[PDB]
C-alpha cells in the first residue's frame, strides 16, 4: 500500500528518487537503488559544518557574518546574517567562510570522527560538499539524522541543541527538524531533504531525488510531506 503510493509521488514528478525512513531502515520511492548510491551532500552538510564550527569556537550563534559586497549567486544572500539565517537560506558563502575558519586539517579530522559519508573532504576546504569528493548515501544521511535527533553525535549536548534550533522547521500538535540540499554544480543535480520527526519517538527521514533542470525546490518538501502523511503523520 504505502510502497505503491510513495512510488507514485516520484513517478508523477517525472524524475527518480527515494525516501529513507528510520533501529530499522525502510526505503520507498521509484528508484530504490539511489538508497545505495552516494551523492554530494550539498547544503545538508551545513548541519555538520555548523556543529564543527560551534564546538571548536569558530563562530557563535549570535555572530553576524557580514556581506563584503561582492555579488553572490542569489540576491537573498547579499546581506549580513547569522549562522541560523544562513542555515534557513542555504547561504553557501557564509558556510564557506565558516569552513575556512575551521580549516582543512580540523575539518577532515572531525568528518572522519563523525563518520560522515565517505569521509573524504579532499584538499579544498570550502567546496568539498558541493562538488565532491565528499559523498554520502541517503541511508548514511538518515543515520546521521537519527544520531542527531538522539544527541548521539560526538559533540557536546549543548552544541547539538544549538544547531537543532537552526533546523526546527515545523511544530504541530510533535516537531520536524530538517535541512534541504540542492547540488546544482554537479550533473545530474541532486536534491535532498534530511531530518526527523519528533512525536516521544523520533523518526528520521532522508529524501534524495534527481532535480531535473527547472524543477522547483518545493518538490522536495512536497514529496517528503506527502510520504510522511501516507505513512501516518
Question: Among all residues, which ones are annotated catalytic?
Answer: 43
Nearer Cβ to Na ion, position 83 or 176? 83
d(CA 39, CA 51): 21
- Out of 95, 128, 192, 196, the only residue in the binding site for Na ion (CB under 5 A) is 95
Residues 2-61 that bind Na ion (CB under 5 A): 45-46, 49
Minimum CB–partner distance for residue 50 and Na ion (Å): 8
Q: What are phi and psi of 170, to 5 degrees?
A: -155, 140
Q: What angle do CA 96, 218, 70 make, to 5 degrees?
A: 30
Eight-state DSSP code of residue 58: S
Instruction: Please choose, from the candidates 169, 214, 215, 231, the residue with its C-alpha nearest in 3D space to the C-alpha of residue 194.
Output: 169
Q: Which is nearer to Na ion, 49 or 227 (CB)?
A: 49
Strand partners, 170: 176
- Cell, residue 171: 511544530
Least gap, CB of 95 to Na ion (angstroms): 4
CB of 172 to Na ion, least distance (A): 28
Distances (CA, A) of 78 to 69, 70, 74, 185, 202: 7, 8, 7, 20, 36
- Return the number of the residue (32 or 184) whose C-beta is nearest Na ion: 184
Nearer residue to Na ion within complex by CB, 95 or 155 = 95
Stretch that binds Na ion, among 62-70, 93-101, 146-154, 201-209 (CB under 5 A): 93-101
Asked if 102 touches Na ion (CB under 5 A), the answer is no
Distance, CA of 113 to CA of 55 (rounded, Å): 14
Write each residue from 172 to 201 as x if it is in contact with Na ion (CB under 5 A), else as -, in one continuous string: ------------------------------
Site residues (vs Na ion, CB under 5 A): 45-46, 49, 95
Amino acid at each position: 500500500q504505502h510502497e505503491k503510493a510513495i512510488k507514485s509521488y516520484f513517478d508523477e514528478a517525472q524524475t527518480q528518487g527515494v525516501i529513507i525512513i528510520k533501529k530499522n531502515i525502510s526505503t520507498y520511492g521509484n528508484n530504490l537503488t539511489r538508497a545505495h548510491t552516494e551523492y554530494v551532500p550539498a547544503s545538508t552538510f551545513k548541519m555538520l559544518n555548523a556543529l564543527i564550527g560551534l564546538e571548536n569556537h569558530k563562530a557563535t550563534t549570535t555572530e553576524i557574518f557580514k556581506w563584503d559586497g561582492k555579488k553572490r549567486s542569489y540576491p537573498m544572500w547579499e546581506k549580513d546574517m547569522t549562522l541560523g539565517d544562513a542555515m534557513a537560506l542555504s547561504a553557501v558563502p557564509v558556510y564557506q567562510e565558516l569552513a575556512r575558519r575551521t580549516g582543512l586539517d580540523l575539518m577532515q579530522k572531525e568528518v572522519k570522527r563523525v563518520g560522515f559519508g565517505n569521509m573524504n573532504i579532499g584538499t579544498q576546504v570550502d567546496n568539498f560538499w558541493l562538488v565532491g569528493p565528499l559523498k554520502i548515501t541517503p541511508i548514511q544521511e538518515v543515520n546521521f539524522a537519527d544520531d542527531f535527533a538522539n544527541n548521539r553525535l560526538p559533540f557536546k549536548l549543548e552544541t547539538q541543541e544549538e544547531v537543532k534550533k537552526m533546523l526546527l522547521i515545523k511544530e504541530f500538535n510533535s516537531k520536524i527538524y530538517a535541512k534541504s540540499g540542492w547540488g546544482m554544480a554537479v550533473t545530474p543535480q541532486v536534491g535532498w531533504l534530511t531530518g526527523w520527526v519528533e512525536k516521544g519517538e523520533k523518526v528520521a527521514f532522508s529524501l534524495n531525488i534527481e532535480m531535473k533542470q527547472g524543477m522547483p525546490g518545493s518538490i522536495r518538501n512536497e514529496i517528503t510531506y506527502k510520504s510522511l502523511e501516507n505513512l501516518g503523520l
